[PDB]
Amino acid sequence: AHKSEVAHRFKDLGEENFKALVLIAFAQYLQQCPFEDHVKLVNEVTEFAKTCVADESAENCDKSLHTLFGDKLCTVATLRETYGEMADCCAKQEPERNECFLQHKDDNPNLPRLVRPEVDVMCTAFHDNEETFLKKYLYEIARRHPYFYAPELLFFAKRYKAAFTECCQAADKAACLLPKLDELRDEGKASSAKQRLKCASLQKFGERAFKAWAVARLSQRFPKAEFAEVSKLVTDLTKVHTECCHGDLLECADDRADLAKYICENQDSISSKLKECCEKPLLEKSHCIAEVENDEMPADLPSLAADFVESKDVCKNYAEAKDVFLGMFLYEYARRHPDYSVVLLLRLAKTYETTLEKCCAAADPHECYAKVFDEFKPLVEEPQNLIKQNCELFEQLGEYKFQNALLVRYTKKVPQVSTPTLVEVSRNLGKVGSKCCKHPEAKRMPCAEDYLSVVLNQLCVLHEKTPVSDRVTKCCTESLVNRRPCFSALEVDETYVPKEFNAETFTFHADICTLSEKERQIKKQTALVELVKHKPKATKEQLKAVMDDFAAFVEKCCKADDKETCFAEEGKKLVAASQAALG
């Protein structure tokens, strides 16, 4: 385990995973190296690994992984020419060498975008050589996201393999494969967006706020565990997290493996759902535990009223160790409510906290905080009702028209955002509607919280980069607890001057009869935004009526003999017919 580390890892992970992970790891530091150069390093390091597996005492096998990895990079011939100052790391010794190498990874590496090829090209190369196809895939993706946690990249790659194997043997290949690739693309973006997000909030809001989140989530996850067990897990998760944000793969991997191992030895104190996850090999344990469903809540748990409102010792128990007492409050409220979004429980803890700070300093504290549960009622119900209305609207409209409803709604709130971004955000929220509303009330709020925090990151990313609105900046730099409530609170922009009418913007051709669904939808949806941008006062009945005539327009000219001129001529009509109705 400790003697030769390379040999322990090769035995722990097996040859295939080790190769994959070594490929990923080199691809994450050496981003501008060609695949064939990467394949060659991996084969060298893999053969060197095997000598150590035969003999822990063979030469250099006793070296550390950081030493060996660093050494290997320093051999890359074009290290100075390609990577510039990254070469200068090789002058240092192996505490500092490793750290210097980690500094020079490049988040924005400036490579061209990866164009998903055609299904038949893909399925052919997959059949032609699975390993080359997949590991080239893997390299191309890893080198554009050098901070993406390597084993989680390997688990996505395994599901890439599975999708190709099922779909390249099917009748309608593209109908099978394309929707799997969209699923996998979005998870990977979400999982990368959610990694990037939780690290920044650690650095911006501190270790206390993060521990508050962890207590919430772990208690919902493990409601049968004692507070003391939950709190231990919060301390060790907080460290695992702190260290993975720093970004040293092996450091991250050891911490997580240690937490997974401790959890697997203490199941009885934590959950009865981990039996399977804990029998899995090291590579997969922590990931598996991370995604396990909530444990069943204990029967007939009592009111929080006794310990947190009615007790005469509330202020005393609070004042002697505040954060613990709030931790206990957050624990008991959260284990009773796997139906709340984590950030809703954090509102409630903060509301409680604020009332205890006020009332324990007051003339009569017991009278003062007697009704603190009344303050919770409206904060609980605000998201419940908003989920209900939006999922009702989605049931009557379907995904596509629900997106238009949203597209209109948010164009009116923030007309300054560019039209392509309004289209992407709308569409994306439509999918959140489509997934999360298929759950019953019990699970709607957790689903939305994890999907919206992805979509709302993408948005603040785009808006940090190209700002247009103070109000959008406000919500994007608030607490992560008020982020969504902030965006929800945005009113319709009443300063906005209607956009100048442009003719080409509402000029259509027969190319829309020929496009795919998505593309046709995006081009329709782009036009509805620009329409709302020119006629922002347009009512729901006026907008629907413009859409209905347009629903006829496209369907007339798309099937009525030799057709590009209707588009030109029956187009002139609709524009003017609309301009009269809206003006």
Ligand SMILES: CCCCCC/C=C/CCCCCCCC(=O)O
């Ligand atoms: C000499 C070069 C060294 C190359 C090896 C690099 C990485 C190998 C191991 C990767 C991480 C495995 C642990 C996963 C566990 C966890 O996430 O819970």
Ligand SMILES: CCCCCC/C=C/CCCCCCCC(=O)O
């Ligand atoms: C950059 C502009 C786009 C803004 C997108 C904001 C989406 C946030 C999630 C839900 C907000 C809706 C709640 C308010 C009331 C409502 O209209 O139902």
Ligand SMILES: CCCCCC/C=C\CCCCCCCC(=O)O
């Ligand atoms: C003993 C275990 C740890 C205790 C954790 C602290 C208790 C909760 C503190 C009050 C609520 C804070 C919510 C998030 C803060 C934020 O908005 O940035």
Ligand SMILES: CCCCCC/C=C\CCCCCCCC(=O)O
């Ligand atoms: C568009 C379909 C579903 C929309 C859901 C309705 C409004 C928000 C749901 C409540 C979630 C609580 C807050 C979590 C988000 C966060 O602060 O990042």
